[PDB]
Paper text:
12 Here, we report the crystal structure of an intermediate-mimicking PaFabB variant at 1.3 Å resolution. Here, the catalytic residue Cys161 of PaFabB was mutated to Ala161. PaFabB C161A crystallized as a dimer and has the same overall fold as observed before for FabB and FabF from other organisms. The crystal was in the space group C 2 2 21 and contained 2 protein molecules in the asymmetric unit. The two catalytic histidines, His296 and His331, are highly conserved and well aligned with the catalytic histidines from both VcFabB and PaFabF. Due to the high concentration of ethylene glycol (20% v/v) and salt in the well and protein buffers, respectively (150 mM NaCl and 200 mM NaI), 18 ethylene glycol molecules and 11 ions (Cl - and I -) were identified and placed in the crystal structure of PaFabB C161A during refinement. The C161A mutation of FabB in this crystal structure causes Phe 391 to be in the ‘open’ conformation and allows targeting of the intermediate-acylated state of FabB; in a similar manner to the natural antibiotic platensimycin.
The enzyme catalyses the Claisen condensation of malonyl-ACP (acyl carrier protein) with acyl-ACP via an acyl-enzyme intermediate. Cells lacking FabB are auxotroph for unsaturated fatty acids, making FabB an essential gene for the bacteria.
Numbering used by the authors:
A (entry chain A), B (entry chain B): 1 to 404
The structure:
């Protein structure tokens, strides 16, 4: 089958809105989590978030921006970065063999709330004509494919925390089917109390670290108490290898493995069994040893351990270095898969492994695995794996191999 | 390349909640559209909908149903029907080589509204722990994969009106990649004023027929005035041919063509050009003449004609018989693609072409095309085509060939 590489990236996140800032914060171990006054004012129990600090209206053409909620807007800025990074020409961006596969976990709870408040107070006409494109499940793909004049595939995948990892794997598969040469893959996620309250109510979020927000997300720590919600966007340029070499592309990495499985077990907790099969499917096409695993690792009591049990079954006594970057970044939901793919690309480009932050007391149930608690500098980091596991028992695993 | 057939179906719709009732209403030309008092009470300008008449809480065990909104519930009941219809065994349904690809355009605006009303009036805990799975973009896949113990692929696609057509085509592609043998493909969509108001506010919906609701959806009629929103669910069993033959499956049709393209131009306005490329891509793998085209045909002034311009460019003087079944069913959004695939399968089983209803005066801009205004009985239907075109310039076309 045709080989597939990544030739450009872009990111909007609480760790930074450009690759150099994000790389630096991963290397230094600086969390992007902050206190969220709006959460406290609205009666949430979790008062922490990984929030993006941007004036989106000053960064995006108004004709484009009117159709967007924050999820699309974050993804759009990430895509602009990825296009610049990749050096693709307008004709390489806009042609039947170049596509877009990008999604979100939610869409825009804020625009939905505004629409209904408006209906009740002011009537239907005052809702305005832009709410469907901001709130539909395809908001991220629709709002990007249209202004970038994408002519190839155009759809969104939604698979909760697996969303943007499935997007990248499906971009690879569209190229392997022979249907596309270039696919923009990624995701976006709005961060607002109108979405975070739903997670608070199901008992998913951190609450015990509201006074020390930078410490709240602490995968593998004995005092972890739920995930820290986040927003943002990411996009990668997925490209067929011969196309990339012929145009003199920069090549970060080859996509060498991809798994997508289902637990068929519990709506909210991983089975561990599905994750084992997902990692094995990703590894079935990989000959090189795995140097680093970026876990799903959300800072939840059950989930962090269940995934580690699966890692132990897959690798036995030969596990790779492991960290969760969610201890720094929080959980960007639909954006988590592409964010973590990007973090892994930046680690390989920079020759370092980000440590698993905020571990005061390593959970004894994971202490036999090589959980990296500090940055590994001067790392010969060639082959990396990232897991993304969402509600509904949906699993995604990507394996990337550094291009020399 | 592996061949792909459809071996089971299920449907929840305003035309019926079983395939025999639906087939009868298609043949007789009986619309499912009714007056919606809640729309009028809430100040919408459109007072018509295609609504499902089911007591969902009597049909789905509460332990399953608590995680669902209506979109997932409709899809679940369609999947129960498709499982019975297919004759698959529990070991064939729950297997690493059996997957689920099913989505929605929205998810649950009703559950979002209830959650925020509850947060404001009663606080965060009273929202309850079920709202994320009801409202997340992957609600339809998550809420089915878990109880049916799906082990293979598991994710949603969201692409507006193309959603469940892309689900079917991607199910076909997973089988062609060699990754799955059976994939449940389809979609679901909630119908509620909290979603319909968004479409009303963009000027998309019919308003001139509120006193005569069954006449409101009237694709190609000179006095069409917008689409009629609907809800429901549909699911088809997409299966590798040798697997189907070995297990003695019933076989409706082979999937012989699939297109998926992007306009890369208008967020909402119909393109003509993207539709031409999508139909050509579907037809590139088809040698048989097309006997029938089920258009997207939403009963919009511009959209109906833009699509017919594309059909004229693709087929010229050899255009197939055409009808829009949306004049009967309304527009089920995320469920439209699988609903119309099912209607086409039922037309091939019954040897009839459903008439394009409610045409008092055929629009002169489409009158040169063979738009059937009445049901054709004793129709020799071997190869049928269905278009689904969504906001964001997303396009799908499926071509199905009757299995003799
Ligand atoms: Cl396990
Ligand atoms: Cl998660
Ligand atoms: Cl939609
Ligand atoms: Cl309470
Ligand atoms: Cl006629
Ligand atoms: Cl539409």
């Amino acid at each position: 089958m045709r080989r597939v590489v990544i030739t450009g990236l872009g990111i909007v996140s609480c760790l930074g809105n450009d690759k150099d800032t994000v790389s630096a914060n991963l290397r230094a171990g600086r969390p992007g989590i902050r206190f969220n006054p709006s959460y406290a004012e609205m009666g949430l129990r979790s008062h922490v978030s990984g929030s993006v600090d941007l004036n989106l209206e000053e960064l995006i053409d108004r004709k484009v921006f009117r159709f967007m909620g924050d999820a699309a807007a974050y993804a759009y800025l990430a895509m602009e970065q990825a296009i610049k990074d990749s050096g693709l020409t307008p004709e390489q961006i806009s042609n039947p063999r170049t596509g877009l596969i990008a999604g979100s976990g939610g869409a825009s709870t804020l625009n939905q709330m505004e629409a209904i408040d408006t209906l009740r107070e002011k009537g239907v006409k005052r809702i305005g004509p832009y709410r469907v494109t901001r709130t539909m499940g395809s908001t991220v793909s629709a709002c990007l494919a249209t202004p970038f004049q994408i002519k190839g595939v155009n759809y969104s995948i939604s698979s909760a925390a697996a969303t943007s990892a499935h997007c990248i794997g499906q971009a690879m598969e569209q190229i392997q089917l022979g249907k596309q040469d270039v696919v923009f893959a990624g995701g976006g996620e709005e961060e607002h109390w109108s979405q975070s309250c739903l997670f608070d109510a199901m008992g998913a979020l951190s609450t015990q670290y509201n006074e020390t927000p930078e410490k709240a997300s602490r995968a593998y720590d004995a005092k972890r108490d739920g995930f820290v919600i986040a927003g943002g966007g990411g996009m990668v340029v997925v490209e067929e290898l011969e196309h990339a070499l012929k145009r003199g592309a920069k090549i970060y990495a080859e996509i060498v493995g991809y798994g997508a499985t289902s637990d068929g077990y519990d709506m909210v907790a991983p089975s561990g069994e599905g994750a084992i099969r997902c990692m094995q499917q990703a590894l079935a096409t990989v000959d090189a040893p795995i140097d680093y695993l970026n876990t799903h690792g959300t800072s939840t009591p059950v989930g962090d351990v269940a995934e580690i049990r699966g890692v132990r079954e897959v690798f036995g006594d030969k596990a790779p270095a492991i960290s969760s970057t969610k201890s720094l970044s929080g959980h960007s939901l639909g954006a988590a898969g592409v964010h973590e793919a990007i973090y892994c690309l930046l680690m390989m480009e920079g020759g370092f492994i980000a440590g698993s932050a905020n571990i005061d007391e390593l959970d004894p149930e994971v202490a036999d695995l090589p959980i990296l608690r500090e940055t590994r500098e001067n790392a010969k980091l060639d082959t990396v794996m990232s897991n993304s596991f969402g509600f509904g028992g949906t699993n995604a695993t990507l394996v990337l191999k550094r291009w020399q």
